[PDB]
Amino acid sequence: CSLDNGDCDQFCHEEQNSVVCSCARGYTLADNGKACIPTGPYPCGKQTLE
Amino acid sequence: IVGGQECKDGECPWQALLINEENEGFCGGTILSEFYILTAAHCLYQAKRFKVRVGDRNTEQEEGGEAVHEVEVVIKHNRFTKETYDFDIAVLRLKTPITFRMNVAPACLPERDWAESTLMTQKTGIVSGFGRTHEKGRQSTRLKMLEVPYVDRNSCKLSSSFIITQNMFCAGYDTKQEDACQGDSGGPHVTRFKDTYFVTGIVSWGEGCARKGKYGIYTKVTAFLKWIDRSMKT
Numbered sequence A: 001c002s003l004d005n006g007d008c009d010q011f012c013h014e015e016q017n018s019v020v021c022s023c024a025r026g027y028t029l030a031d032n033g034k035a036c037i038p039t040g041p042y043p044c045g046k047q048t049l050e
Numbered sequence B: 001i002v003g004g005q006e007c008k009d010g011e012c013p014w015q016a017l018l019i020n021e022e023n024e025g026f027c028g029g030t031i032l033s034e035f036y037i038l039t040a041a042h043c044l045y046q047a048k049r050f051k052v053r054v055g056d057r058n059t060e061q062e063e064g065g066e067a068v069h070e071v072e073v074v075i076k077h078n079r080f081t082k083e084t085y086d087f088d089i090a091v092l093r094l095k096t097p098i099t100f101r102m103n104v105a106p107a108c109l110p111e112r113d114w115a116e117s118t119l120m121t122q123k124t125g126i127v128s129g130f131g132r133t134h135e136k137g138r139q140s141t142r143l144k145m146l147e148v149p150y151v152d153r154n155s156c157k158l159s160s161s162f163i164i165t166q167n168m169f170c171a172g173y174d175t176k177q178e179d180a181c182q183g184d185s186g187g188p189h190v191t192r193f194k195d196t197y198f199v200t201g202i203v204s205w206g207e208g209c210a211r212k213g214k215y216g217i218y219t220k221v222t223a224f225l226k227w228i229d230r231s232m233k234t
């Protein structure tokens, strides 16, 4: 996870000499297993738009 | 906030304001979820009774989105003491849930190890609030934000009259006249990673505001992630 954050959008951990991405509550890991997908209209940590 | 600028609509949605009986703001808070607000333990000593306002950006005008919430439970860290200002953290459970909307959304809580190695190593964080715009000056009627660089723990300790503990971290500028200030206390310090903002600190204390050779001191949220999780599960 040392560089590029394991290509993870949010959390990165090394599970068995291998990169594992994960996300904050209110998000779901995307098919690519790197991006994080919000579950609702106001997911945590995102600035709001009208 | 000294220096910095006014937040735009939806730019600092996790900001909360603690208001006293006089309906006057005296500390900030950070929205963690529909029922919980993160703030500083020292703030709880200022007003016997207080409520929480969310969605406000101008305290002199009532605008769409502002809402007031009563606090149901106050969970103050049992090791907080004004002697050292260590463990300056508290969680508030509200009586009724916050409805997220434009200007009202929670900041994300990060995973501990990742936050320590990836978030706390970023160059800057963002602090915001309705506090004084100058040391001993008037509180801001508008919500302000300020980008503040993380400061090396050792440089900070050398600059400080008081002990900097592992439950704190420093941020700000040596001489540039920008800093958080009294009144911003309890408020959010967030760090953006890619396109998500994570709460990393709680505005805690400082010697004056924006003083040359002094920095802003924040409660290090990563040190309390398990405490927060336990506190949030009633």
Ligand SMILES: NS(=O)(=O)N1C[C@H](C(=O)Nc2ccc(Cl)cc2)[C@@H](C(=O)Nc2ccc(-n3ccccc3=O)cc2F)C1
Binding pocket: B082, B083, B084, B085, B132, B134, B135, B136, B137, B162, B163, B179, B180, B181, B182, B185, B203, B204, B205, B206, B207, B208, B209, B210, B215, B216, B217, B218
């Ligand atoms: N009336 S004022 O001049 O505008 N105001 C500005 C200072 C402030 O809060 N700035 C400020 C600056 C930057 C940021 Cl991030 C937050 C607050 C505040 C103060 O002096 N706070 C303060 C100072 C020291 C400790 N402390 C720390 C260790 C041990 C014991 C101990 O008492 C606790 C404190 F409350 C007085």
Ligand SMILES: [Ca+2]
Binding pocket: B056, B057, B058, B059, B060, B061, B062, B063, B066
């Ligand atoms: Ca207002």
Ligand code: NA
Binding pocket: B172, B173, B174, B175, B176, B210, B211, B212, B213, B214, B215
């Ligand atoms: Na300074």
